[PDB]
Structures are given as C-alpha cells and as structure tokens.
Design an enzyme around this catalytic site. Structure first.
Site, PDB file in Angstrom:
ATOM      1  CG  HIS A 104      23.967  -4.633  26.889  1.00  0.00           C
ATOM      2  ND1 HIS A 104      24.443  -5.119  25.689  1.00  0.00           N
ATOM      3  CD2 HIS A 104      23.296  -3.494  26.593  1.00  0.00           C
ATOM      4  CE1 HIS A 104      24.057  -4.323  24.709  1.00  0.00           C
ATOM      5  NE2 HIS A 104      23.367  -3.321  25.232  1.00  0.00           N
TER       6      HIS A 104
ATOM      7  CB  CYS B 189      24.764  -1.056  22.986  1.00  0.00           C
ATOM      8  SG  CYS B 189      22.959  -1.072  22.837  1.00  0.00           S
TER       9      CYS B 189
ATOM     10  CD  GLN C  72      21.202 -10.730  18.577  1.00  0.00           C
ATOM     11  OE1 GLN C  72      21.711 -11.819  18.300  1.00  0.00           O
ATOM     12  NE2 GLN C  72      21.633  -9.591  18.058  1.00  0.00           N
TER      13      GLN C  72
ATOM     14  CB  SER D 259      24.822  -7.404  18.611  1.00  0.00           C
ATOM     15  OG  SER D 259      23.443  -7.707  18.479  1.00  0.00           O
TER      16      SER D 259
ATOM     17  CG  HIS E 166      26.045  -8.714  24.611  1.00  0.00           C
ATOM     18  ND1 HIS E 166      25.322  -7.593  24.250  1.00  0.00           N
ATOM     19  CD2 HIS E 166      26.001  -9.551  23.546  1.00  0.00           C
ATOM     20  CE1 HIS E 166      24.850  -7.755  23.026  1.00  0.00           C
ATOM     21  NE2 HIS E 166      25.261  -8.928  22.571  1.00  0.00           N
TER      22      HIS E 166
HETATM   23  C1  LIG Z   1      20.039  -7.408  24.146  1.00  0.00           C
HETATM   24  C2  LIG Z   1      20.356  -7.633  22.704  1.00  0.00           C
HETATM   25  O1  LIG Z   1      19.962  -8.652  22.129  1.00  0.00           O
HETATM   26  C3  LIG Z   1      21.137  -6.626  22.008  1.00  0.00           C
HETATM   27  C4  LIG Z   1      21.388  -5.298  22.472  1.00  0.00           C
HETATM   28  C5  LIG Z   1      22.175  -4.684  21.543  1.00  0.00           C
HETATM   29  N1  LIG Z   1      22.436  -5.568  20.544  1.00  0.00           N
HETATM   30  C6  LIG Z   1      21.816  -6.751  20.811  1.00  0.00           C
HETATM   31  C1  LIG Z   2      23.787  11.080  23.541  1.00  0.00           C
HETATM   32  C2  LIG Z   2      24.097  10.001  22.552  1.00  0.00           C
HETATM   33  O1  LIG Z   2      23.666  10.077  21.406  1.00  0.00           O
HETATM   34  C3  LIG Z   2      24.918   8.872  22.963  1.00  0.00           C
HETATM   35  C4  LIG Z   2      25.091   7.650  22.240  1.00  0.00           C
HETATM   36  C5  LIG Z   2      25.943   6.870  22.965  1.00  0.00           C
HETATM   37  N1  LIG Z   2      26.311   7.547  24.084  1.00  0.00           N
HETATM   38  C6  LIG Z   2      25.699   8.766  24.098  1.00  0.00           C
END
Ligand SMILES: CC(=O)c1cc[nH]c1
Ligand SMILES: CC(=O)c1cc[nH]c1
Ligand SMILES: CC(=O)c1cc[nH]c1
Length: 147
Positions: free
Chosen positions: A43, A97, A115, A138, A141
């Site tokens: 996502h 995320c 969710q 959140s 998405h």
């Molecule tokens: C899949 C889901 O519910 C999420 C993922 C990041 N925030 C919510």
């Molecule tokens: C390596 C790391 O902490 C991350 C978090 C988001 N993308 C990279």
C-alpha cells in the site's frame, strides 16, 4: 452478474459504459475478471491533518488537508495507470507508512487484523489488481494485492 463489489456505470464525458467497485473504489473501462484465508498486499498511504497520528517518517507534523491528500492519491494513481511511475517506486518515495522501506509491502494477513475498510478492499481485490482511494482512520490508501 459481476464479481464482488463491481457495478456498471455510464461515463459522463464519453457516454461509454465503465466498471466501478464500491469496496475498493477501483474504476476501469474493461469488464473485470470473474475467498482465501489470507492475502498479501502493498500500500501507499497519504496522511492528512485528521489522521489518527498526523506524523510520519516523511514529516514530523503532517498538516495537509484531507482534500489535499486525496488529490495526491489521485495523482499517484494517474501516474501508475499511465506507466509513468511504478507503484513500488511511488510507495518507497511517498508513502507516509513505515512500510515505505519495503516498497509498501505489508506481508500476508487475515480478516480481523487490519482496519476494516482496508481489509475489505484487500479481500475484494484479486491478485495483481489495485484499488482506488481507500479511506481509513490512518489516512488515504492505494492498495496493491500481490498474493
Ligand atoms: C493496513 C492498515 O490498516 C494500515 C496500515 C497503515 N495504517 C493503517
Ligand atoms: C529505513 C527506514 O527507517 C525507512 C522508513 C521509511 N522508509 C525508510
Ligand atoms: C480486466 C481488468 O481488470 C483490467 C484490464 C485493464 N485494466 C483492468
């Protein structure tokens, strides 16, 4: 008639029929192809000021509006569908995320873990298919079902 969630509608500009899914918010011209214990999804999340945690690895304080986040999501979907950009590339660069570090991959999961509107869209997607904008507490998405 059609696989779960899919309906038929009329294009306002062209007058040609198209297909839309009210669980995933996907839409497309082509008639969709015709449930498992688990699915695997990736996502891309765009948070906004009304998200549950208005912060991410990209931004200590996320201040964009829900409308602004939806415009970003719509822009990413356009670039994915045109092939200008890959889903995994946009997710690594722009997802709010932490799963961005894994090209948006969340691994496999069952019903009753994520969710609800995310779960419902994920299980209504077929393998390979992608959602339109999916709204959760959140944020907003784009979901890609990989397994
Ligand atoms: C899949 C889901 O519910 C999420 C993922 C990041 N925030 C919510
Ligand atoms: C390596 C790391 O902490 C991350 C978090 C988001 N993308 C990279
Ligand atoms: C059949 C289907 O789901 C398609 C085809 C092109 N885009 C979506």
């Amino acid at each position: 008639k059609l696989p779960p969630g899919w309906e038929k509608a009329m294009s306002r500009s062209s007058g040609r029929v198209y297909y839309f899914n009210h669980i995933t918010n996907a839409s497309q011209w082509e008639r969709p192809s015709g449930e498992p214990a688990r699915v695997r999804c990736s996502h891309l999340l765009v948070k906004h000021s009304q998200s549950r945690r208005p912060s991410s690895w990209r931004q200590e304080k996320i201040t964009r509006t829900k409308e602004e986040a939806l415009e970003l999501i719509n822009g990413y979907i356009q670039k994915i569908k045109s092939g200008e950009e890959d889903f995994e590339s946009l997710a690594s660069q722009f997802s709010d995320c932490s799963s961005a570090k894994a090209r948006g991959d969340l691994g496999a999961f069952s019903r009753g873990q994520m969710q609800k509107p995310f779960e419902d869209a994920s299980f209504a997607l077929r393998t390979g298919e992608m959602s339109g904008p999916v709204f959760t507490d959140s944020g907003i998405h784009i979901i890609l079902r990989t397994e």
